């Protein structure tokens, strides 16, 4: 299906981690911040729903 993903490339040219922006609100937050590590607090997200 046509979906939105975010991928991480390491120091050897391979894919090591990925996330789907339409699955969970936490994953949507990760896709909005564009990082895998997020801190304590409240954020505002985009519409990948």
């Amino acid at each position: 299906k046509p979906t939105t993903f975010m991928l991480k490339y390491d120091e050897n040219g391979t894919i090591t981690d990925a996330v789907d922006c339409s699955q969970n609100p936490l994953a949507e937050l990760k896709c909005s911040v564009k990082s895998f590590e997020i801190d304590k607090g409240i954020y505002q997200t985009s519409n990948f729903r």
Binding site: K34, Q44, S46
Partner: protein
């Protein structure tokens, strides 16, 4: 004499936030694809407003 006088001072203003993707390309997939080419510009305004 005893005089009471008043002084008015502003303290805060309204807090606002803007959704960049729905302001620029409203419900358009093609415009969304063309907007990702302009990288890390919509994430620079949300930081300022926060």
């Amino acid at each position: 004499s005893i005089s009471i006088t008043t002084e008015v001072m502003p303290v805060s203003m309204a807090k606002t936030s803007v959704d960049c993707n729905m302001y620029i390309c409203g419900d358009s997939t093609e415009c969304a694809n063309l907007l990702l080419q302009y990288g890390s510009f919509c994430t620079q305004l949300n930081r300022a407003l926060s």
